[PDB]
Amino acid sequence: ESAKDMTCQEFIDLNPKAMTPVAWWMLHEETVYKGGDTVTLNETDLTQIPKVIEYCKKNPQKNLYTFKN
Amino acid sequence: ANESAKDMTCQEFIDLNPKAMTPVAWWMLHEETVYKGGDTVTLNETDLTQIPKVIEYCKKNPQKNLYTFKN
């Protein structure tokens, strides 16, 4: 029941108010934080999160975390 | 307007895909705070104790907003 177990279909079906935190976590957990003094969205997220959504629409059966491959 | 992560109600939180609860709670607890983690972004022991308290808070107060946990 971890985020790494979430499918792309589950991701695109999330309450919209959950999609940004979930996408952020997938993109950033277990990576170096490069975003500055405070935790915030940054331009990388502006460009990547829409790509995650599109990737998951095209590949709903794949796990969300396969975006990183 | 009413569609942002900051606007999530406690009822919405307890109704989430269970796989989303930890990332949503983490973001609520950490967004806009000073980053005090190590080299990489990981859960810490404060998250271990606080995230269950977030779940309990929203179960007890479904009418309140998630982000009011911080108050």
Numbering used by the authors:
A (entry chain A): 32 to 100
B (entry chain B): 30 to 100
Could you give the paper's own sentences about this structure?
Two proteins, HdeA and HdeB, were discovered as abundant periplasmic proteins in stationary-phase Escherichia coli cells, and genetic studies implicated them in survival of extremely acid pH. HdeA and HdeB have been shown, in vitro, to have acid-activated chaperone functions; that is, by binding to acid-denatured proteins, they prevent these other proteins from irreversible aggregation and precipitation. Like HdeA, HdeB is dimeric at neutral pH but forms monomers at low pH (∼ pH 3.5). We have determined the structure of HdeB and the mechanism of its acid sensing, identifying two critical salt bridges that are broken upon exposure to low pH.
Here, we report the crystal structure of HdeB at pH 4.5 and biophysical characterization of HdeB at both acid and neutral pH. The asymmetric unit of the crystal contains four protein monomers with residues A30 to A102 ordered; six C-terminal residues and the His-tag are disordered. The monomeric structure is composed of two 12-residue helices (α2 and α3), three short (4 or 5 residues) helices (α1, α4, and α5), and interconnecting loops. Analysis with PISA13 reveals that the four monomers in the asymmetric unit are arranged as two identical dimers of HdeB. The dimer is identified as stable by the program PISA13 and the dimer interface buries in total 2400 Å2 of surface area, much of it involving hydrophobic residues. There are six main-chain intersubunit hydrogen bonds (akin to a β-sheet interaction) formed between the loop from each monomer that connects the two long helices. Two tryptophan residues (W55 and W56) and a tyrosine residue (Y64) from each monomer come together to make a cluster of aromatic residues at the C-terminal end of α2. The crystal structure shows an intersubunit salt bridge at the dimer interface of HdeB: E41 from one subunit with K48 from the other and internal salt bridge within each monomer D76–H59. Asp76 makes a polar contact with the indole nitrogen of Trp55 and a salt bridge with His59, which in turn stacks against the indole of W55. The two α2 helices in the HdeA dimer are almost parallel, whereas they are almost perpendicular in the HdeB dimer.
